[PDB]
């Protein structure tokens, strides 16, 4: 069984930028989530080989995880905060699409998403 290549975390042709909102996203948002007790399943791409999930990447064609998001933020991959917010939403939605209600992973995602939304509610206005 094989995993797909992970989402890119750098791109030679993609313009790069660091905004106050992007800094908040790394320093406050990703920080709060990364250290949460439920963060670890989301800290790297889903390893469908190790987890024996042969259908994972047949169902999930836009994978995303907080390890990828962290590297994108650190590498200044993004132009704006919305791109990063979108990656978080992709991560959460993928979890709800692939998994079933009551699954442990779904309960973990829901908790993390609640914290996520709390933190982005105070996203600072762009300078
Ligand atoms: C987003 N996500 C993440 C993981 C996950 C990934 C890793 S990882 C980074 O090392 O690949 C490490 C632990 C993980 O979940 C741990 C789980 C307790 C909460 C995941 C795992 C499964 C799964 C199914 N079964 C059945 C026996 F195999 N076992 N596990 C299903 C969906 C997901 C998913 O949707």
Curated annotation (Swiss-Prot):
Localization of this protein: Nucleus; Chromosome
Expression sites by tissue: Ubiquitously expressed.
Cross-link (Glycyl lysine isopeptide (Lys-Gly) (interchain with G-Cter in SUMO2)): 58
Effect of mutating residue 104 to G: Found in a patient with a neurodevelopmental syndrome; uncertain significance
Modification(s) after translation: Phosphorylation by CK2 disrupt the intramolecular binding between the bromo domain 2 and the NPS region and promotes binding between the NPS and the BID regions, leading to activate the protein and promote binding to acetylated histones. In absence of phosphorylation, BRD4 does not localize to p53/TP53 target gene promoters, phosphorylation promoting recruitment to p53/TP53 target promoters.
Coiled-coil intervals: none
Domain of life: Eukaryota
Domain Bromo residue range list: 17-123
Site positions for Acetylated histone binding: 99
Disease listed for this protein: Cornelia de Lange syndrome 6: A form of Cornelia de Lange syndrome, a clinically heterogeneous developmental disorder associated with malformations affecting multiple systems. It is characterized by facial dysmorphisms, abnormal hands and feet, growth delay, cognitive retardation, hirsutism, gastroesophageal dysfunction and cardiac, ophthalmologic and genitourinary anomalies. CDLS6 inheritance is autosomal dominant.
Additional record remark: JQ1, a thieno-triazolo-1,4-diazepine derivative, and I-BET, a benzodiazepine derivative, have been tested on tumors with success. Treatment with GSK1210151A (I-BET151, a I-BET derivative) has strong effets on mixed lineage leukemia and promotes myeloid differentiation and leukemia stem-cell depletion.
Subunit structure: Interacts with p53/TP53; the interaction is direct. Interacts (via CTD region) with CDK9 and CCNT1, acting as an associated component of P-TEFb complex. Interacts with RELA (when acetylated at 'Lys-310'). Interacts (via NET domain) with NSD3, CHD4, BICRA and ATAD5. The interaction with BICRA bridges BRD4 to the GBAF complex. Interacts (via NET domain) with JMJD6 (via JmjC and N-terminal domains); the interaction is stronger in presence of ssRNA and recruits JMJD6 on distal enhancers. Interacts with NSD3. Interacts with NIPBL. (Microbial infection) Interacts with bovine papillomavirus type 1 regulatory protein E2. This interactions may serve for the tethering of viral genomes to host mitotic chromosomes allowing successful partitioning of the viral genome during cell division.
Family: Belongs to the BET family.
Function as written in the Swiss-Prot or TrEMBL entry: Chromatin reader protein that recognizes and binds acetylated histones and plays a key role in transmission of epigenetic memory across cell divisions and transcription regulation. Remains associated with acetylated chromatin throughout the entire cell cycle and provides epigenetic memory for postmitotic G1 gene transcription by preserving acetylated chromatin status and maintaining high-order chromatin structure. During interphase, plays a key role in regulating the transcription of signal-inducible genes by associating with the P-TEFb complex and recruiting it to promoters.
Domain observations: The NET domain mediates interaction with a number of chromatin proteins involved in transcription regulation (NSD3, JMJD6, CHD4, GLTSCR1 and ATAD5).
Name listed for the protein in its UniProt record: Bromodomain-containing protein 4
Species whose genome carries this gene: Homo sapiens (Human)
Phylogenetic placement of the source organism: Eukaryota, Metazoa, Chordata, Craniata, Vertebrata
Shown stretch of the complete protein: 44 to 168 of 1362
């Amino acid at each position: 069984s094989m995993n797909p290549p992970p989402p890119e975390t750098s791109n030679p042709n993609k313009p790069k930028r660091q905004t106050n909102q992007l800094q908040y996203l790394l320093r406050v948002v990703l920080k709060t989530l990364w250290k949460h007790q439920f963060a670890w399943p989301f800290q790297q791409p889903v390893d469908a080989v190790k987890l024996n999930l042969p259908d994972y990447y047949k169902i999930i064609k836009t994978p995303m995880d907080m390890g990828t998001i962290k590297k994108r933020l650190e590498n200044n991959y993004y132009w704006n905060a919305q791109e990063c917010i979108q990656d978080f939403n992709t991560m959460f939605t993928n979890c709800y699409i692939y998994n079933k209600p009551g699954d442990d992973i779904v309960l973990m995602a829901e908790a993390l998403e609640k914290l996520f939304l709390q933190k982005i509610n105070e996203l600072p206005t762009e300078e």
